[PDB]
Symmetry: D2
Subunit: 317 residues, 4 copies
């Protein structure tokens, strides 16, 4: 997965991410409403959501989310972090306990901002527990965004939960966040204009083209840094998709250790100010959209907005 | 520009191309009908079209085409070829004379197949003449496709018009076609599966990521060669777009000598068997489609199918 | 600079390094004898050497060493580490205080092995103090070796002296050691034999060619990992030079921010077991050698072995 | 193999080359005297040498040369050119016939300059014939130099002997010469000084590091283009070795299809004006020299100057 934030000329923010995976997740955009009672798989204890939100989710016992945007402008995305993610084995105490795949639900339901996350996260404990559908502990890390325009990355390490100001506003997968930010120093020579002619693009030589996390990180940062400013929310959504097109894996390009096809299943963009969640997916290019605020946020139960599944083609004749 | 052919499991062919440029071309899909009389800018002599077709075009005196698919399955795309394209200065005789920006119109209107092109092209002469809108001679070369599944590339050189079997079924810009095909030998090590773990993609290391023509050529060939087979026309169109997403230039990424923004304005896919022309453009992700055969091909004049210009967003609520 | 250890088949060990700089250092190989009194620029306090050693140095008040090999088989090399080196600003107490440029003298004069290093270093303080010649505090980090065949890299950080087991037996410059070892994971696909014909070397595609520190680190690990075993000392010394030839900077190839030419001035190889110091420099390819043990190690004063400066040419006729 | 010419400030010229192979060639520097009779493996016909020369060769019936420098300042080197070399299968007439491995002997024995080459070659036929030792027809191409400072590369193709002015003064192996010169256009952004801090060398990012022929060609052009001027012959010879250090293959780094180790066996530098042949080999770094003119150039038979085989170490104590 590749994620990035962008800021438009009229001052909105979006958080955008591709979801690259071999197993089919079958996520759909879902409203998780306010005052919704759920029980953690860490210890069975009950929680009650405070803020409503929408994001890509799947009912697996509770409804687990890969990302989402809440009613107060906080947005979050969970991306794979294999080999680096390390959780608590032993249940602490005087802490809330959740499992890794609950963090999105937690943070979006209980926090209203980045300041808020930085504070509540001090009494949280994420513990090592499998996701049955996969029979494995999800190795994850998270990128978050709110209406101040700041960005965080949060990474569950052996040393505990680490929080970073994410200045580039980009994040992919392993290794750890400082590693990637340091790696950017190798790439400050790539630039849009040639120095002083098969065609255009020569300044761009050295941009990594492969699908490894470090290269996708560098290629996102390059394209974000030289993006012509986008005027408004819609133009921002387009740009985030244009950039993420460059990190879209066609089926067949990448094969896992198990002979599975690792490809981009969906790409989404979430707008912090407007509560809009846009997306397309491998099989349908047309942007789809859910507006959080058209819904009854005191709804009694989750609401699913199911997607158009095939290529939506506009016939001119 | 990046172009490529693909073949689906049910045996259709598509020819796909991005159109990367700094100046706004304002092309629209247009039907050029059968028996349509036009006069060449080479010498003023009259021609009469034999085959109807559709492609991206612009009225500039006559309607000039950047690509197109005709009523008998021949498809063609003109891509920039700067510094390498060389035309006839002196008007020969016993030949048809056209200017570079007429080749698409010519070949699509007068030829019914690749065999046919290879034969008619022997009595053709392309002469050096400007395109007024640009006050410059277009340096171009062409990729063509028909229902046999073969592909050609044709390149106007100092030595005359050169014709190549295009075995990879890919073409970008300069330098010449054999140069790129030879350059592919450097890249046969890139592969979808790692040898024997920040994540996926490690076999893919070395894939060029920059926007130069040679790198776009290599990156297209890689993605075409490892594309999981596409089952039918629609799935083929999706795949061609998924591959070309990887060669889509966001505004700002690439700047010309003149400080202009060189970006991908539109991407199209043309199906040889069905006469369908699909496309999207920088500002609207949704595929748009014109079916050649729904039209009256004996129409008296060109017909324009003008495109939806803004982002067509499907609202789920 | 690039440094690396090697093991020969007869189980000797060598530590090797190029010295890349813009300022002409003018090091010569010097013997520092045992029981030699000196005083630290840190605080003026007395030191008495315990172990004799040889290495490239220069008299600049006391005699400053870039590297060396001692009588009991410990070797060390100091390499530039700009932006990351961080020393103690304030004098602690109950500790031995030295300045950065005295580390090599200290460690080699006082320690008899890597174990001995890991223990004495626990009560060392390195303090921020300028080298006068250059009017700057040297940013440095160190690689060390002994007769056990283990290796260490020691890096002065904000948080204190960090000590790492150096498994690859390679170090260049910035960034920090764990950064580099982590970065090697992107390069595990590079390999001597092609997969399945311009010539040889296609498996090697991807090896970094530039002179930046991360690139030279990866290229040294590749070459060392795949070196055929060297039978003995001489062969070990040859091999080390053959590898480091690949990270040798000719004059003009790299230019600093101040417009100075930054180039490889000398290359040395030290054998741990035999106290042999071999080198060559930019202007004389022939290997030159100093045998620590041929000298009186109790000598009252340091002894300089000045290099043949010109290309030493063997004339066959 | 990698080869390159250099010009010194005092206007001497050198032609330099590494010899990379898997089979041990066992060349020694040999003087081929003037007025020496030999017969071609092509047809048994008589030849009488006109100009004495020295170069690395081996007695294999006649004495076969990989390179050399003649008495009137012409230099040549033969380098592998697999897949692209194409000789004459049938014996022509009114032409001098030779086999591939006799080119160096022929050109150097009979031609006094590059002009003289371009003229005599008009009536040369190179015929397909095996070298027995290897049971294969050598695929070869050649770079040449004289006292004018011009350079040529000559490549045996399907279509005849092609002769090119070699502006860069560099040649490696396959593919063809114009291929490489064209490929240099992708690399014009590489440069000694950074744009606007792990260390030095950031402008150099992008220089190819692998051992394939196109990569070594680009790396040699970069280094030669940016070499500081060498004051005189000796300095020229040093510089040539410093450059070619960067294309020096240690044992194990590259492995052939047959599982043989392909490594740099020797490196030579020939000065055109002075008939000086310098070299070193894998096992002995010290430069060794043969002075063509110290010999009797009318000598009745060839004379071998056998190399110091072991590392020649200069002992300072």
């Amino acid at each position: 997965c590749t994620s990035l934030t962008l800021e438009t000329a009229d001052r909105k923010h979006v958080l955008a991410r591709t979801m690259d995976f071999a197993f089919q997740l079958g996520t759909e955009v879902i409203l998780y409403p306010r005052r919704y009672s759920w029980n953690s798989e860490a210890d069975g204890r009950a929680h009650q959501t405070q803020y409503a939100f929408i994001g890509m989710g799947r009912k697996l016992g509770n409804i687990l989310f890969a990302d989402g945007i809440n009613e107060s402008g906080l947005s979050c995305a969970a991306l794979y972090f294999p080999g680096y993610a390390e959780y608590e084995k032993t249940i602490r105490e005087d802490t809330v306990h959740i499992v890794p795949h609950e963090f999105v639900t937690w943070v979006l339901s209980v926090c209203q901002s980045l300041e808020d996350v930085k504070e509540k996260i001090r009494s949280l404990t994420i513990v090592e527990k499998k996701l049955d559908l996969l029979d494995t502990v999800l190795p994850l890390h998270w990128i978050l965004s709110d209406r101040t325009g700041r960005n965080l990355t949060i990474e569950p390490r052996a040393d505990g939960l680490k929080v970073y100001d994410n200045q580039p506003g980009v994040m992919t997968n392993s290794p750890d966040f400082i590693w990637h930010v340091t790696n950017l120093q190798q790439y400050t020579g790539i630039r849009p204009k040639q120095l002083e002619a098969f065609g255009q693009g020569l300044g761009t030589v050295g941009l990594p083209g492969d699908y490894t996390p470090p290269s996708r990180f560098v290629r996102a940062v390059y394209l974000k840094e030289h993006l012509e400013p986008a005027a408004d929310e819609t133009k921002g959504v387009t740009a985030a998709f244009q950039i993420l097109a460059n990190m879209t894996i066609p089926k067949g390009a990448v094969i896992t250790e198990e002979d599975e096809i690792h490809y981009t299943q969906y790409t989404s963009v979430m707008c912090n100010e407007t509560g809009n969640y846009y997306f397309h997916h491998y099989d349908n290019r047309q942007i789809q959209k859910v507006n959080l605020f058209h819904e009854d946020l005191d709804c009694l139960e989750p609401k699913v907005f199911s997607a158009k599944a095939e290529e939506s083609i506009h016939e001119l004749n």
